[PDB]
Amino acid sequence: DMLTLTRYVMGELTQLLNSMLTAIKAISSAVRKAVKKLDVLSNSLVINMLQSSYSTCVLVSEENKDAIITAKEKRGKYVVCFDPLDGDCLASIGTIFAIYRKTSEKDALQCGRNIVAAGYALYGSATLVALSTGQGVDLFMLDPALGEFVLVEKDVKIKKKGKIYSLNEGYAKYFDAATTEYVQKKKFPEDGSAPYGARYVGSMVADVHRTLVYGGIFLYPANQKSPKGKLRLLYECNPVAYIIEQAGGLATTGTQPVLDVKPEAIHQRVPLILGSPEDVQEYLTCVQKN
Amino acid sequence: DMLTLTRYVMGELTQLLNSMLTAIKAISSAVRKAVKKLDVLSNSLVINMLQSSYSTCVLVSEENKDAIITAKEKRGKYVVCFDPLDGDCLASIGTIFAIYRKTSEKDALQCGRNIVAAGYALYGSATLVALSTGQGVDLFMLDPALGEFVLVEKDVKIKKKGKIYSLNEGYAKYFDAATTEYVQKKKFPEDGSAPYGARYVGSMVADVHRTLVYGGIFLYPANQKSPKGKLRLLYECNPVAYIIEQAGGLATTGTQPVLDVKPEAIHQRVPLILGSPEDVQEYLTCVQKN
Amino acid sequence: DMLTLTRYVMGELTQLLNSMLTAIKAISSAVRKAVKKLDVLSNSLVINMLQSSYSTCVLVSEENKDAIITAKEKRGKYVVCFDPLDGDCLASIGTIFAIYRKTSEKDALQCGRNIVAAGYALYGSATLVALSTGQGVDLFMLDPALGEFVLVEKDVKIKKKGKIYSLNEGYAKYFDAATTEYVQKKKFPEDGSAPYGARYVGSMVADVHRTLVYGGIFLYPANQKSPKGKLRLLYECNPVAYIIEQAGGLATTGTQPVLDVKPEAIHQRVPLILGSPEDVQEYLTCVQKN
Amino acid sequence: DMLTLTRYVMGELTQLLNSMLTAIKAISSAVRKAVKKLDVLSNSLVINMLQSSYSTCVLVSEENKDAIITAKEKRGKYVVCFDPLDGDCLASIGTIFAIYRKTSEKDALQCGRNIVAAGYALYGSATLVALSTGQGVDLFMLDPALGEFVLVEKDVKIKKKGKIYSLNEGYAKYFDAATTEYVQKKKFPEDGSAPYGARYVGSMVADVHRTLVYGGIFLYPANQKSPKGKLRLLYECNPVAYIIEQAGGLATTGTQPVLDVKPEAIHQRVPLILGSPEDVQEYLTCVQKN
Ligand SMILES: O=P(O)(O)OC[C@H]1O[C@](O)(CO)[C@@H](O)[C@@H]1O
Ligand SMILES: O=P(O)(O)OC[C@H]1O[C@](O)(CO)[C@@H](O)[C@@H]1O
Ligand SMILES: O=P(O)(O)OC[C@H]1O[C@](O)(CO)[C@@H](O)[C@@H]1O
Ligand SMILES: O=P(O)(O)OC[C@H]1O[C@](O)(CO)[C@@H](O)[C@@H]1O
């Protein structure tokens, strides 16, 4: 029942990640105590902790129309795109972020392929963080007594093929043909296998995290209502795509890898299909055939 | 930023509820720190806290094959049927319980209509308890610093009609005709209205709680795989049926109210459809017509 | 085991007290996790939370040589003198503050008699706050789960006469004659009564708080080493003098009430003798006779 | 801001220490929430956690007149003497314990020299445990979020000579000549050095812990009122004597080392003088000369 603690590592980058985690700790504490007000607070904590890291030059927030430029005093090398509070019914909500090195708004419009670090936090019974700096995915638990994030699994790997599919089937009347076919195959396998189970929390970080630890596939594809999908490329899709690919998974828009999409605006939406590679590949077969 | 605290109330009954809440506080703390081991612990905490309340005579636990009879020393008037830990991916899991007055195992086999109190706890970012002693539903938050449950809403009422439907559609190939028709109507409304949204966490307490605070309908109906449904009558369906009806909702097996089912065994399963009354009533129309 | 919470009250004044409590909550959390660094942090939290209350115009901090003037944007009516962190061996350390209405540094140099509110926090096993706005002393416990201060006793009253005396007797060779005589009487009562017990934590807030709840007397009188005493008039002696007098006690320098001392500098020291009135009065008799 | 955790170690002995720590965690939580009732609870937690370790055969508690014999079912090799709750004014109170290997009550009446492990917990702003299994003293912090004790210093060593003396000088009129002389020398050094500072919290664990981390001397010697001292040999003096000696200090009754006293009853009191060795040695010189 006794432990020793040791500091864990994965320059300006380290200070920036510490400050993003420090904001996550504060948001966790606010969420536990608890809408519009939480969104504002969360945004303030992220922006201000990130700015006073002295590591940032440009931020993009889900909450702010335009990119935020760091005061010249505090400027550093990195660009951060984040969703401070993504997602009341205690459904686990989250924080999502991706970090780039600078190249103006320009700097925030890079291919996901250029990511240097990314992560998400999920505010559940425990506050969990998944993080990658390009050498796999590590999972951490917030210890709010220490004020520190504890490593709980190294180099998380997603299953090659899962048995869960996850999307809002309430949009069935708007689905494109490939989504309709794929869903039909999950429920009516044509190969003598059992149907997949269905899960959809309706909070992206919750659904993506389940997909990472249990395997399967998560989808918010384009539909007649949302022709470009709903989820946001810079600070939702790209970060989770990076995490999922670093765990051995795939993430696609249907027509290309999410991380290869060249962004055309900071609040651009894209379709998102991700998870176990054999599952995503099966979805991709339905696309190409339609 | 300053508060005063006041004790809240809804004899042996009060001691019993205090001890069930005390077990819930301990389980919350165990869950936050975290499978089979948790199930065992949770069960131990409930049984032992309940037994030393000196208010119980018979317990039924999801975890135990036979009913547990309280030592004659500690015996009181009440019977408690509970699921100590219902539901790893931080999906909110829960504890469910219903309390009866005695009439042997016999005493645990009463109609839901005979319930004196019931509740559930959901272990999310916060640990929430819904409770009723027959005069409506009250919602409480665990304050683990005080070690006490704080009232956060009195007399919770569910919406007459919602816009969410919640079931595992991965069982579509096993659905009975009425379930197939109902799902089809939610996705393809024949009245010019928008489709319902779909949500399914796959943890009953999470799905039921969302249904109470946002409205809509939750279903685990009979299907070819599970001809009697999956969820357990004594300590899952009856307790949540009691809560939901006390909030102005309905809960049915498809052929009768859950609380009117006369149990034939302690671990008996029944189909469960519950939520907003107009939604459940619509489901019932699909049944009667098939 | 169930509670209801109700907001408690004692305009700009209320916003200011909320922000001082909010800083106390943050300091509590920092202390629990834990020298020079804590002093700096504590100071930052107080100054910044107080400034963005929009209720302050001038601050005096134990940590800062000169008075801090609030930016004209954020200016309000009140003046706050505080010791952000007063007192490693887990000895309970504290935060002390007094609030005045403005009249420049001038505004911080008022008689204690002019205080509008004052308090201290003690960071023990629990974080406790004593507070007065002039209508007695109220005691609060920090509930760090709610993020709120809970009332635990109204209108705290100190005993007329106690049985504890509290001072650093290691300074005996420097004591003035009246202190020597008084100490001698506590140990060698000339009236057939039992000796007083001795207690000295060596952290002022700990010693003062014990004196309030158990009764007796606390002293840091002048001595040959410290001819004006050690403790600071504006943000140690005056605040605790105000609290102690509001609980029915007395606080003196030996020659006059602490709250009547007209300050001659912001970091001025004064002797401090406080506690149960009959005890302080006995000390005062030793003074007048010498 | 990221950490890794590693299990720390110092057979039945390990299970016993885990269960004593588990009781300490529960007591910490009770203290934080808070007299006679706490004493009872604390005692229950220790006894029951210790008994179900399956490592004990005989317990002695400050709270119980006679030794407690473990049910033959649960019996193991070890004997535990403990003070479950030693020491309301937030003064840090504590838990003290010493562990022996068996030789009946007989087994609890061994010389301190026979101790296999001992420790104390102090319930402050943080809950700290000092522990030794005979290879020095290790200091741990309770992390109540993890439910685990974190190592914060290895092999703690007390200063050879300190500058604090700690005793209740309110007993001056009852002191024996050697105590009077020693106190006089601390206040009136005859060697041109400065007087010692005085500290006395009046809670033994608080005073002993300060003495370990800051150095100096702590005394509760015999006096006319308490001719055998006040503190209890088996579960106060012996445990802290063992800790203090393992940190390079000394602990004496005035006439012999505490750990060499052969106990004559389980609730026997002895005088206690402990701390920095040069300080204790100086006290011993005053004894021998009187
Ligand atoms: O209700 P819908 O259309 O299924 O939207 C769900 C999505 O909306 C969001 O809340 C918006 O980012 C995501 O968390 C989630 O994945
Ligand atoms: O995976 P399925 O068949 O949808 O089962 C989900 C149900 O199983 C349970 O875990 C068992 O009680 C419920 O919490 C939940 O509602
Ligand atoms: O060591 P000394 O001289 O007794 O000083 C103790 C005093 O010093 C302080 O730490 C300084 O404010 C007070 O908390 C305390 O009352
Ligand atoms: O009030 P006194 O005689 O100084 O007693 C203090 C002692 O009493 C105890 O509370 C009893 O164990 C100890 O914690 C402490 O050292």
User: Do D35 and D176 fall into the same domain?
Assistant: no
Nearest chain D residue to A16, by CA: D1
Among B163, B169, B200, which would you mutate to test the A interface (most chain A Cβ atoms within 10 Å of its Cβ)?
B169
Is some CB atom of chain A closer than 8 A to the CB atom of B126?
A: yes
Interface contact D2-A22, CB threshold 8 A: no
Nearest alpha-carbon partner for D166 in C199, C91, C174: C199
Say if residue A56 is in the same domain as residue A129: yes
Across the A/C interface, how many CB contacts are shorter than 8 Å?
Answer: 10
Closest CA to B266 of B110, B127, B126, B152: B110
β-strands C117-123, C127-132: how paired? antiparallel
- Asked if residue C87 and residue C209 are part of one domain, the reply reads no
Report CB contact under 8 Å: D172, C195: yes
A1 and A137 inside one domain: yes
Q: From atom 5 of ligand 2, which residue's Cα is the shortest distance away?
A: B202
Q: Resolution in A, one decimal?
A: 2.0
- Rounded CA separation A127/A149 (Å): 9
Which ligand neighbours the alpha carbon of B170 most closely? Answer: 2
Residue D70 CA to residue B4 CA, distance in Å, equals 45
Specify whether D241 is located in the same domain as D202: yes
> Whose structure tokens read 């170690």?
D9
Same-domain pairing of C163 and C117: no
Long-range CB contacts (within 8 A, 24+) of A190-197: A194/A163, A195/B170, A195/B171, A195/B172, A195/B173, A196/A162, A196/A163, A196/A164, A196/A165, A196/B170, A197/A163, A197/A164, A197/A165, A197/B168, A197/B170, A197/B202
DSSP state, A136?
-
The parent domain of residue C107 ranges over 1-156
Burial category of B194 from C-beta neighbours within 10 Å (exposed 0-12, middle 13-18, buried 19 and up): exposed
**What DSSP state is assigned to residue A269?**
B
Q: Which residue of C has its CA nearest to A143?
A: C33
Pair (B6, B147) in one structural domain = yes
Do B200 and A196 count as a contact with CB atoms less than 8 A apart? no
Q: Are C273 and C251 in contact (CB under 8 A)?
A: yes
Name every chain A residue with its beta carbon within 8 A of the beta carbon of C33: 145-147
- Looking at the fold, whether A172 and A78 belong to one and the same domain comes out as no
Same domain, C150 and C161: no
The verdict on whether residue D229 carries a ligand-binding annotation is no
Nearest residue of A to residue B168, measured between CA atoms: A198
* Angle, CA of A60, A62 and A63, to the nearest 5°: 105
Is the same domain home to A57 and A138? yes
Instruction: Tell me if A2 and D143 make a contact (CB, 8 A cut-off).
Output: no
The edge-to-edge listing of strands for the beta sheet with D197-198 is D197-198, D164-166, D217-220, D272-275, D250-252
Question: Ligand 1 centroid vs B127 CA: distance in angstroms?
Answer: 24
D165 DSSP β-pair partners: D198, D217
Least Cα distance to B265 among B110, B67, B109 occurs for: B109
- Burial class of residue D135, CB neighbours in 10 A (0-12, 13-18, 19+): exposed
Which of the 8 DSSP states describes residue D172? G
A195 lines ligand 2 (CB under 6 A): no
Number of structural domains, chain B? 2
Task: Work out how many CB contacts closer than 8 A connect A with B.
Answer: 114
Which three-class secondary structure state does DSSP give residue C223? strand
What atom in ligand 4 is closest to the CA of residue D231? 12
A touches which chains (3+ CB pairs under 8 A)? B, C, D
Q: What DSSP element (H or E) covers C151?
A: strand C148-153
Q: State whether the beta carbon of B204 lies less than 6 angstroms from ligand 2.
A: yes
Task: For residue D147, list chain B residues with Cβ-Cβ distance below 8 A.
Answer: 29, 33
Q: Read off the CATH number of the domain in which D26 is found.
A: 3.30.540.10
Residue C220, Cβ density class (10 Å: 0-12 exposed, 13-18 middle, ≥19 buried): buried
Nearest to A2 by CA among D13, D244, D17, D48: D17
Same domain, residue pair B139 and B192: no
Query: What approach was used to elucidate this structure?
Result: X-ray
Task: Please name the member of B3, B145, B149 whose beta carbon is closest to the beta carbon of C1.
Answer: B149
Boundary (domain end) residue, out of A106, A121, A156: A156
3-state secondary structure chain B: CEEEEEECCCCHHHHHHHHHHHHHHHHHHHHHCCCHHHHHHHHHHHHHHHHCCCCEEEEEECCCCCCEECCHHHCCCEEEEEEEEECCCCCCEEEEEEEEECCCHHHHCCCHHHCCEEEEEEECCCEEEEEECCCCCEEEEEECCCCEEEEEECCCCCCCCCCEEECCHHHHHHECHHHHHHHHHHHCCCCCCCCCEECECCCHHHHHHHHHHHCCEEEECCECCCCCCCCEHHHHHHHHHHHHHHCCCEEECCCCEHHHCCCCCCCCECCEEEECHHHHHHHHHHHHHC
Nearest CA in chain C to A33: C146
Residue A270 DSSP symbol? -
CATH number, domain of A169, equals 3.40.190.80
Q: Does B195 touch chain D (CB under 8 A)?
A: no
- From the alpha carbon of D93, which atom of ligand 4 is closest? 14
Q: Rounded distance, CA A123 to CA A135, Å?
A: 25
Of D130, D156, D182, the residue that ends a domain is D156
Residue finishing a domain among C124, C156, C188: C156
Best mutation target among B29, B31, B143 (most D Cβ atoms within 10 Å) is: B29
* CB environment B211-230: b (16+ within 10 A), e (fewer): bbbbbbbbbbbbbeeeeebb
For tokens 């993020």, the residue is C147
What would the two tokens of residue D58 be?
């005989």
> Do C53 and C133 lie in a common domain?
yes
Q: Candidates B83, B86, B165, B174: which one to mutate for ligand 2, based on the most atoms within 8 Å of Cβ?
A: B86
As given in the structure block, the two tokens for residue C152 are 């635990």
Q: Are A20 and A26 in contact (CB under 8 A)?
A: no
Ligand 3 centroid–CA C200 distance in Å is 10
Question: How far apart, in Å, do the first and last CA atoms of chain B sit?
Answer: 58
Provide φ and ψ at B161, rounded to 5°: -150, 135
Binding site listing of B for AMP = 9, 11-14, 77-78, 101
Beta bridge partners of A36: none
